[PDB]
Amino acid sequence: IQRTPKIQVYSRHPAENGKSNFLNCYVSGFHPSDIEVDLLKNGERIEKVEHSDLSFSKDWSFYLLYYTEFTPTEKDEYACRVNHVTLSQPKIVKWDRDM
Amino acid sequence: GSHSMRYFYTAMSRPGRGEPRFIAVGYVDDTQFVRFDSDAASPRTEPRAPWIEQEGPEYWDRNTQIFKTNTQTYRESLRNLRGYYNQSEAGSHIIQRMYGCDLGPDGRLLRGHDQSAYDGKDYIALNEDLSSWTAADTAAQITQRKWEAARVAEQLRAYLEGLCVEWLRRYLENGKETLQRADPPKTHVTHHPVSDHEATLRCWALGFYPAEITLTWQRDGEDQTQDTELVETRPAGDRTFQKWAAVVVPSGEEQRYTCHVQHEGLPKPLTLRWEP
Amino acid sequence: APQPAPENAY
Secondary structure, three states: OEEEOOEEEEOOOOOOOOOOOEEEEEEEEEEOOEEEEEEEEEEEEEEOEEOOEEEEOOOOEEEEEEEEEOOOOOOOOEEEEEEEOOOOOOOEEEEEEEO | EEEEEEEEEEEOOOOOOOOEEEEEEEEEOOEEEEEOOOOOOOOOOEEOOOHHHOHHHHHHHHHHHHHHHHHHHHHHHHHHHHHHHOOOOOOOEEEEEEEEEEEEOOOOEEEEEEEEEEEOOOEEEEEEOOOOOEEOOEEEEEEEEHHHHHHHHHHHHHHHHHHHHHHHHHHHOHHHOOOOHOOOOOEEEEEEEEOOOOOEEEEEEEEEOOOOOOEEEEOOEEOHHOHHHHHHEOOOOOEEEEEEEEEEEEEOOOHHEEEEEEOOOOOOEEEEEOOO | OOOOOOOOOO
């Protein structure tokens, strides 16, 4: 049938407030392949965001990495918004620097 | 073995929104090196790793023609399978194909692969003998008779034992500084108090390559498999991967827990514990 | 390098 996406939001390097890093949202284990992923900054969609080329794992499920440079802070909140056919409502996952 | 090359093809139909999209990507171990997307402005095979750029024009035109030709053939195949399942022309479907060769640590062909799926379910796969097929259902059985009648296995075997291994060895050499370099994980243990009597110990592994790794928590020399939260290895975006394993423990008993890390880049497995 | 010979439709 169809498989819902697993989602992980994290940074490329250890988070250091005031220091430039990269924000990642890794969506995996989903099928079919169409998926909508947005990175958010304080609830607002970040404009410049890139993603890897569509590929899949041994179980045939797809995986994609969406990423964008960013400079962490104590106040600013970050998150990934994912929509897939298997989701009745877009799923939001906040960035947790300890995850 | 120690190395492999894989190509991954995805063809997706989308009725009412043009012809089926075809995308192809090639990898050597966990490093992608080429891509092709029939939806691009000007479809062409493009480089995705530094070491493949040196290939001449003939390489790229050859690749592009193959993927362009495939783009058309997969559209035919999607029509064929829709019929094999008596499906409607109104639904979107997906054929996926993975194929490649595995090399042993010495460089000899360990084994070849070629499997397909339809809508995420295994459909047909070339057996390890590289001579026979395993079809999942009566629909795939039609693809099988057709491929046996066209001596497809014979051609796959020649490529898998021939060109596949040849080009993989060439890539391994041109990109040896990275493809033949294992980067060990940077490890540490964090502590996150949950309640007055419980706390979370999270064992981290960062910046490692390749993606293969073993991360486990033990309590008293013993494994906490069923009690360990293990996230899926994830890409950092700089070629390396990350992974962590967590276990909730009774406050005060943290010293009875040890984290064990196994990675190709490690001459010897690592044992970690929380260091207050 | 990808499998070269023209692929047979499914």
